Paper text:
There were two main types of filaments, the minority type (type 1) comprising a pair of identical protofilaments and the majority type (type 2) comprising two protofilament pairs running side by side. In type 1 filaments, the individual protofilaments pack against each other with 2-start (pseudo-21) helical symmetry through a large interface, made of residues H14–G37 in an extended conformation. The N-terminal strands β1 and β2 fold back on the opposite side of β3, enclosing a network of electrostatic interactions and hydrogen bonds formed by the polar side chains of H6, S8, E11, H13 and K16, and capped by the interlocking aromatic side chains of F4 and F20. The N-terminal substructure formed by the β1–β3 region is similar to that derived from the low-resolution map. A comparison of our type 1 filament structure at 2.7 Å with the previously reported structure at 4.4 Å revealed differences in the atomic models. Compared to our model, the previously reported model has the same sequence assignment for the N-terminal 23 residues of Aβ40, but the rest of the sequence is misaligned by up to two residues. Minor differences were due to a distinct side chain orientation of Y10. One of the two structures described in this preprint appears to be identical to the structure of the type 1 Aβ40 filaments that we report, including the new sequence assignment of the 15 C-terminal residues.
We used electron cryo-microscopy (cryo-EM) to determine the structures of Aβ40 filaments from the leptomeninges of individuals with Alzheimer’s disease and cerebral amyloid angiopathy.
Residue numbers in the entry: 1 to 38
């Protein structure tokens, strides 16, 4: 669940970057390689 918001007012710039990220190169809460005998 992501809630991202950007509201601009009065901005004067040569360059501007707004970077919002969550899961970039990730395996959050993943199961990888599990053996259960029972």
């Amino acid at each position: 669940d992501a809630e991202f918001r950007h509201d601009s007012g009065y901005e004067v710039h040569h360059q501007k970057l707004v970077f919002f990220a969550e899961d970039v190169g990730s395996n959050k809460g993943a199961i990888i390689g599990l053996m259960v005998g029972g």
